[PDB]
């Protein structure tokens, strides 16, 4: 099974995640500036049905459950982020995580990043 490389953002409001134009890409010192572009995918969970808080997981462009999705496409539960000068190419070489060999990276955002209302890590 596959997984995000990073820990997910939890939603504490009726808001749909959305960053300012140049923010949102989680830090990863082991990737190049060309690779800093992807999407957050919302994951819902119900429990007893009581609906839990939605979590958003980041996947590099061209990987993850929506690997075939071009950057910018409009789909429910998919929002896009990219930092200045990233390449609009699939990041197949980074891929997705296998929890059997690697644990998730703690999601961190660059300094001066503004998280929207009701979103925390």
46 labelled as ligand-binding?
A: no
DSSP lists the bridge partners of residue 75 as: 78
97 labelled as ligand-binding?
A: yes
From the annotation, which residues make up the binding site? 45, 55, 97
From the annotation, which residues make up the binding site for RNA? 45, 55, 97
């Amino acid at each position: 099974n596959t997984a995000s490389w990073f820990t997910a953002l939890t939603q504490h409001g009726k808001e749909d995640l959305k960053f300012p134009r140049g923010q949102g890409v989680p830090i990863n010192t082991n990737s190049s500036p060309d690779d800093q572009i992807g999407y957050y995918r919302r994951a819902t969970r119900r429990i007893r049905m009581k609906d839990l808080s939605p979590r958003w997981y980041f996947y590099y462009l061209g990987t993850g459950p929506e690997a075939g999705l071009p950057y910018g496409a409009n789909k429910d539960g998919i929002i896009w982020v990219a930092t200045e000068g990233a390449l609009n190419t699939p990041k197949d070489h980074i891929g997705t995580r296998n929890p059997a060999n690697n644990a998730a990276i703690v999601l961190q955002l660059p300094q001066g990043t503004t998280l929207p209302k009701g979103f925390y890590a």
